């Protein structure tokens, strides 16, 4: 009847503070508390948590970013904190107007802070990508984790800075609200003809509900097999035991075919950077190419016409 | 034929429906009773499929599509060549779909494993039900599901978002929206440092399950562990199918307005509703 | 049997319907009874009795 | 099955007491608002 | 009629906290019910009665 | 009350104090609530009115 | 008792309850008296 | 007073600290909240009227 | 009793200090509200 | 009165320290912040007002 | 006693130290209402 | 006064300045930010207008 | 009691430094305040 | 000046040489991205102004 | 100190140094100023 979804028995000793393959230990901080509720879901530790100087550089930028952020929302409450808590996420930081195209001209309360912005959140972007890297290589791993968070900057450096540059427009961009993205969202669908004609905007919304499908699948063959110790699957690699062959053999038996306790790895993996690098190329071809994605489904044969 | 460790495995118990009567293999899959009703339910679906396709005159795979009875015929019976066949694709689907779940719990009864698998997929099957099912039946008609073709189901989506204004505006899709996009980011993740612990440097030895842990407590203070990533990405996925089956059945049955109209419902709360200044104000 | 988890999430159900339409009531929103009734039910909920 | 019968028996009997006092207040009470106001 | 068995059944711990909530706040309601009819809710009748309004 | 302590031995006398004050205070707070709700009682509003304070 | 707590104890504990109960009781009453003076609802 | 001290035989004084200042606290912000919000007793805007700041 | 720890001197001298306490709080809470009432009285 | 100090024996100083710096920190920016937005007390338009900077 | 473990002797420098620094920050701030309300009283 | 030193046997002083530091830029940028904000301390602004810049 | 572990003496020579920083901080602050008041008074 | 040296008995100088370079260039390019964002001050368009470019 | 492992040697001569790269840093900073100033003052 165990269902192995919440632990029922928590047990702690001694923090771990983990490996020292060539670490830089000085950069590490301290273990932080134990969370019982984090201990009911997955492991109750807190940190260590390791600060280098890509760690101060990612830090400081993105810091400057939400800060910006927030004082422009705090100037748009006319610092009320009544007006602020009522109109947040109808605040936003809009781009440029479109009469100024790319040029660095435009006014502080029109886009130019908007631009100061940007920067500092692309600095902080790119420093944690380096950070991923960099931590990935101190402990001797392969650089998987690095990839796909680069797949993942494609699809937002396209959204925020390749396709306005060739669009030749800072406006084309995404302001930074809560209610005032989906805003852009929904306009850019509609300026465009219809996003879902798009089709590697279908690609990528494939890719998604297949990572939503393959990782369900995934978690629930884990957890159907951790009476056999399914979990500890990096020694089910090494050493193939019980679990990882009953779990082969039913998606065998299910779908005709299977995987191994890596391959399956490798899917779920390429199944996520898929749906973000294909959206990244739906979002380039979007107006620089294609002004309407229905006409243009309709002249490739996915449209009546 | 077999896998080089599967023989042991191929054992003759765990049915639900029957005895030895259809419990063999037919290759590599599992055909039971349940094999047995999944595949016809899907031959007759996927020829139904062809034989509208004939019938609209149109041999295009993109350009097929089976549409629902109109809303003229409520919730009772339609020709075949107007509504029919919808219906009866749509009973052949939901017949395939619950034998093939009840052939994965025999499956897992043979395997002695647990039932996560056939419960996972019962929720896609609710989701499925609840927009092709329980809205329509709610709604009053078969005409408010979804046709059965590559793009025009798309169409019914933009016409269904649309009659409501802008969609992302409800917060059920909200909520399953931010689901969806954080079980790929973990999928993602988990994906990437399973590989990375298993394939390091070149000449390096295999990583440890330590190495992963610190791999994120490096990065972001905190590790989930291996059973807590697994559970994470089980709820996840189940949480956005859970969701977008809410955000559904409230949609055209007790909403009926623009969803950012009811979003002035925290806006207009008494004790800052005439605060002059802000958005709305 | 039911566990005592069990019986804690049911009162704490009950509960949260019962101090939200309460709360409800006396401030003049909804939200306000959801606010309270929420708090007390996650209270009460997160502190099971054995 | 934690409580033995005469356990059982002396809270029964306590908490019998105790309903038959918050009855008896109740009673009043309706007295006095039937009496502020028929119904 | 010995009635007391339902102490052997259940936990009194339990029982206790159960009928607690349920009395208390089918109370309330019964109070809000009240309150709601424009007859029977006594600040608006008391209100009436000594000209308040 | 013959014998009412055997709530307390039945009750952690902690969870029951804490269960007390949290509904104790919730309780007031309710009433005060819906006296502020009728107009009849709004205390505010009747010391601005007989004080004629707008 | 699933406490553990015995009947000294409880009675003790029982006493001084009682004697917070009718301190705060009292107070209430006052408080209810004073509001009557000022604006009877009956 | 009579025999409350013992209630700290019981809680500990902490827990019980801690709960009470933040209690306090936000009973002083919902208090002075609720004065803001009536146009009575906004010391902020009466004084404004007093004194004609607009 | 062994809940916390404290025995009966302690929790004897630790309420005076906290009576102390709250007397003081009270009576800064008092003076505040008589200023209030004598500048805008509720009643 | 003359033995408050045993609060300290009681309350790890440093972890109090902290939240006393935050707690005063957020008050007084949120007193700020209150007063910039009411049109009175709002010192920056009230100095534009009286030397005419606009 | 001391849970978080201080000597009576270290409590007692720690609290004089303290209400040092609490009667400056007070004063600090009744020099500036004062200041501020000489140049536009709220009252 | 004389006996503020012993802070620094408390808290650490590195973590301190860290915070600090991070503190007075974060308050000093506010505060600037607030100023070009508002019409009039708009130096930029101010001096456009003075010398016709525009 | 020195839970940094900071002595009496490291403690007063930090402080005396500190001190320093901060004193020339807020004089260099003071004469910007004054310039700006000459410049623009916010009074 | 005084004695400020003893800062670096404290500090890593890896850590502060680090930290001051991102906060000079970050805070360096703000002030020019400030810069050129006011139609005044921002040296290209006035350049072309002066010049008849455009 | 122990933090960093520096004697007063060490510490002084890297002080030294990091003040000449200070005030040099600063020397360009002011003349970027003055020419600034000179060609668009912002008072
Ligand atoms: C004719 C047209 C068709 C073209 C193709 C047709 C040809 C036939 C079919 C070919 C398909 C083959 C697919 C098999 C690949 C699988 C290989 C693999 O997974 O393992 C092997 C190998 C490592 O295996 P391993 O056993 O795990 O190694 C362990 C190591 O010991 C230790 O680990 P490590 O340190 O060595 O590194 C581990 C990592 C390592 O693998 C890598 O190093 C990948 C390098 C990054 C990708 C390169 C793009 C970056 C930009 C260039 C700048 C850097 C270049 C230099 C890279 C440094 C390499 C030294 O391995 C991984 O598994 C990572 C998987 C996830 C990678 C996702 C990368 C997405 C980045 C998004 C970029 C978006 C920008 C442009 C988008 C497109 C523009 C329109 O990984 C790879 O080789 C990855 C290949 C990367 C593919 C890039 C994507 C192509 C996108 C094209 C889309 C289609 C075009 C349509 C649009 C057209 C517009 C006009
Ligand atoms: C989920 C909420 C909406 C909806 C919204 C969208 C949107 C929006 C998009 C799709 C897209 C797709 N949808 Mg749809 N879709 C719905 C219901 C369905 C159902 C169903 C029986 O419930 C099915 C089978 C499909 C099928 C499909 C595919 C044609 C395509 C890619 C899905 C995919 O790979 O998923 C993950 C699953 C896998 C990776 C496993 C393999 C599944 C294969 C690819 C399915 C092929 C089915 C075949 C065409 C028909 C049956 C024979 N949709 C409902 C009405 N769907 C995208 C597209 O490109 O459309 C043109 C797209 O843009
Ligand atoms: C009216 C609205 C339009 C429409 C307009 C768009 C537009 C416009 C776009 C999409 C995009 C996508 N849409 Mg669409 N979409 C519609 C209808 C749908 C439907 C549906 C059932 O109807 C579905 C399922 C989808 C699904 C999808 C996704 C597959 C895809 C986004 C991938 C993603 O993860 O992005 C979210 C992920 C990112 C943006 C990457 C972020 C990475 C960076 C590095 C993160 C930085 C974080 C920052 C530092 C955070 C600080 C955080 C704190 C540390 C906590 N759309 C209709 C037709 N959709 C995108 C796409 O690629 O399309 C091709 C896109 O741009
Ligand atoms: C495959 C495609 C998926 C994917 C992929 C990956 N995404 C990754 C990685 C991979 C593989 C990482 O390795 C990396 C990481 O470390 O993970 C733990 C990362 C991250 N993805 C984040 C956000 C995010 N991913 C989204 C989507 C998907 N991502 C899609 C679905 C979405 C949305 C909108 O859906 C959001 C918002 C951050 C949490 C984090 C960067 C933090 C940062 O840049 O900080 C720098 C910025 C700051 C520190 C600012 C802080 C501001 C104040 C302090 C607050
Ligand atoms: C709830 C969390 C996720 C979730 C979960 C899980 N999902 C599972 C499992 C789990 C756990 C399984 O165990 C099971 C399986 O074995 O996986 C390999 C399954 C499966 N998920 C499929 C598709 C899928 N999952 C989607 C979504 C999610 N899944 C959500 C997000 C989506 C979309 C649209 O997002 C799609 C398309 C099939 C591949 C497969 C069923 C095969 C079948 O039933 O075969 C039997 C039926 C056939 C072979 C064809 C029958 C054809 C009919 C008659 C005609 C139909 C025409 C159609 C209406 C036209 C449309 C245009
Ligand atoms: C819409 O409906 C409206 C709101 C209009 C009306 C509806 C109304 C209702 C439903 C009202 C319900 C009112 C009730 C149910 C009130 C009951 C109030 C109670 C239960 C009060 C008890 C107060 C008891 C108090 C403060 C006890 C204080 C005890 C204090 C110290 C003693 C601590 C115990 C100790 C010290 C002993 C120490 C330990 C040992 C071992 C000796
Ligand atoms: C919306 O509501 C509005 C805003 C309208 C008004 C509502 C308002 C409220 C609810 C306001 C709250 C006001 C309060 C309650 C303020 C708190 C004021 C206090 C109590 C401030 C504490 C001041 C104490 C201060 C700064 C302490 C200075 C202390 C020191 C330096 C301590 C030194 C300690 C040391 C050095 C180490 C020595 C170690 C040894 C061993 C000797
Ligand atoms: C919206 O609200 C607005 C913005 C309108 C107004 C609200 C305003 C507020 C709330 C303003 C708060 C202002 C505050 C709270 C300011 C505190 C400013 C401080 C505390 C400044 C400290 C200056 C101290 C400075 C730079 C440090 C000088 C320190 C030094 C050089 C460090 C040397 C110490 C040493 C080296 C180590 C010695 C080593 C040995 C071995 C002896
Ligand atoms: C909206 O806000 C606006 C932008 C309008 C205004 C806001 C403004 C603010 C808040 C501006 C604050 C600016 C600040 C805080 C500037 C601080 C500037 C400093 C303090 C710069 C220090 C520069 C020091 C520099 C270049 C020196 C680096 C020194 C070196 C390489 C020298 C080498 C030292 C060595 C090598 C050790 C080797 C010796 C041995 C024995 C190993
Ligand atoms: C009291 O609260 C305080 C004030 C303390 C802080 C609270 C703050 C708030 C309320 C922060 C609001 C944060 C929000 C609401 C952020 C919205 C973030 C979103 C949702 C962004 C959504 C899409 C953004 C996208 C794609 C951005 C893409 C950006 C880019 C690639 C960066 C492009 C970099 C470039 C443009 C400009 C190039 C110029 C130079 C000099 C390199
Ligand atoms: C409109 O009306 C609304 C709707 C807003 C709500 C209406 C009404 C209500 C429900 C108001 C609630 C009023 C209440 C119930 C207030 C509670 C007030 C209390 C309980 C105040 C306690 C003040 C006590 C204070 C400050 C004591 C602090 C004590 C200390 C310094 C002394 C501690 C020092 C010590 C302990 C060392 C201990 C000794 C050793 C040996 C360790
Ligand atoms: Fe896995």
Redesign the interface.
């Known amino acids: 009847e165990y269902q192995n979804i919440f632990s029922q028995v928590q047990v702690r000793g001694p923090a771990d503070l983990g490996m020292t393959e060539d670490v830089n230990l000085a950069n590490r901080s301290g273990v932080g508390p134990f969370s019982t509720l984090l201990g009911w879901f997955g492991n109750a530790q807190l940190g260590p948590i390791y600060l280098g100087s890509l760690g101060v550089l990612s830090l400081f930028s993105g810091l400057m970013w939400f800060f910006t952020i927030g004082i422009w929302f705090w100037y748009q409450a006319g610092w009320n904190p009544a007006v602020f808590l009522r109109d947040l996420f109808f605040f936003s930081l809009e781009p440029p107007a479109p009469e100024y195209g790319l040029s660095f001209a435009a006014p502080l309360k029109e886009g130019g802070l908007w631009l100061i912005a940007s920067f500092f959140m692309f600095v902080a972007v790119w420093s944690w990508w380096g950070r991923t890297y960099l931590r990935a290589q101190a402990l001797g791993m392969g650089k998987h984790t690095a990839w796909a968070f680069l797949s993942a900057i494609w699809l937002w450096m396209v959204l925020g800075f390749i396709r306005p540059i060739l669009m030749g427009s800072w406006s084309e961009a995404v302001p930074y609200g809560i209610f005032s993205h989906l805003d852009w969202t929904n306009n850019f669908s509609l300026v465009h003809g219809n996003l879902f004609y798009n089709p590697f905007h279908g690609l990528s919304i494939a890719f998604l509900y297949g990572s939503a499908l393959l990782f369900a699948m995934h978690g629930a063959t884990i957890l159907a097999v951790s009476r056999f110790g399914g979990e500890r699957e990096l020694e089910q690699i090494a050493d193939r035991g019980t679990a990882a062959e009953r779990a082969a053999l039913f998606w065998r038996w299910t779908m005709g075919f299977n995987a191994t306790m890596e391959g399956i790895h490798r899917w779920a993996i390429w199944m996520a950077v898929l749906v973000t690098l294909t959206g990244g190329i739906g979002i380039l071809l979007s107006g620089t190419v294609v002004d309407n994605w229905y006409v243009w489904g309709q002249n490739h044969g996915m449209a009546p016409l | 034929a077999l896998l080089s460790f599967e023989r042991k495995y191929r054992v003759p118990g765990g049915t639900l429906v029957g005895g030895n009567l259809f419990d063999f293999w037919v290759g590599p899959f599992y055909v039971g009773f349940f094999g047995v009703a999944t595949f016809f339910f899907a031959a007759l679906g996927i020829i139904l499929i062809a034989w509208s396709a004939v019938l609209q005159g149109t041999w295009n795979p993109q350009l097929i599509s089976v549409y629902p009875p109109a809303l003229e015929y409520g919730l009772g019976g339609a020709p075949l060549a107007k509504g029919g066949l919808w219906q009866i694709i749509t009973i052949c689907a939901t017949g395939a779909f619950v034998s093939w779940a009840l052939r994965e719990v025999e499956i897992c009864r043979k395997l002695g494993i647990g039932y996560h698998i056939p419960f996972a997929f019962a929720f896609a099957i609710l989701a499925y039900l609840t927009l092709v099912l329980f809205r329509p039946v709610m709604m009053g008609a078969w005409g408010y599901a979804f046709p059965y073709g590559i793009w025009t189901h798309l169409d019914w989506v933009s016409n269904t978002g649309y009659t409501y204004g802008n969609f992302h505006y409800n917060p059920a899709h909200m909520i399953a929206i931010s689901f969806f996009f954080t079980n790929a980011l973990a999928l993602a993740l988990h994906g990437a440092l399973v590989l990375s612990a298993a394939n390091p440097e070149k000449g390096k030895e295999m990583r440890t399950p330590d190495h992963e842990d610190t791999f994120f407590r490096d990065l972001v203070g905190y590790s989930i562990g291996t059973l807590g990533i697994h559970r994470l990405g089980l709820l996840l996925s189940l949480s956005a199918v859970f969701f977008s089956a809410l955000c559904m059945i409230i949609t055209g049955t007790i909403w009926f307005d623009q969803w950012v109209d009811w979003w002035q419902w925290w806006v207009k709360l008494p004790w800052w509703a005439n605060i002059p200044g802000g958005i709305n104000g | 049997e039911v566990s005592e988890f069990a019986?804690r999430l049911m009162?704490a159900a009950?509960?949260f319907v019962?101090?939200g339409?309460?709360?409800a009531?006396?401030?003049?929103?909804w939200?306000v009874g959801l606010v309270?009734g929420g708090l007390?039910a996650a209270?009460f909920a997160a502190?099971p009795?054995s | 099955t934690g409580l033995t019968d005469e356990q059982a028996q002396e809270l029964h009997s306590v908490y019998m007491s105790g309903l038959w006092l918050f009855s008896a207040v109740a009673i009043v009470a309706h007295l006095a608002v039937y009496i502020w106001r028929p119904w | 009629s010995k009635f007391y068995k339902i102490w052997m059944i259940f936990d009194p711990r339990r029982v206790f906290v159960a009928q607690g909530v349920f009395l208390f706040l089918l109370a309330v309601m019964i109070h809000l019910i009240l309150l709601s009819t424009p007859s029977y809710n006594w600040l608006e009748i008391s209100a009436a009665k000594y000209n308040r309004v």
């Not at chain 3, 009531?25 to 929103?29: D, E, L």
């Open positions: 019986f009162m009950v509960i019962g101090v339409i309460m709360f009531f006396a401030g003049g929103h939200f309270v007390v209270f502190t009795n």
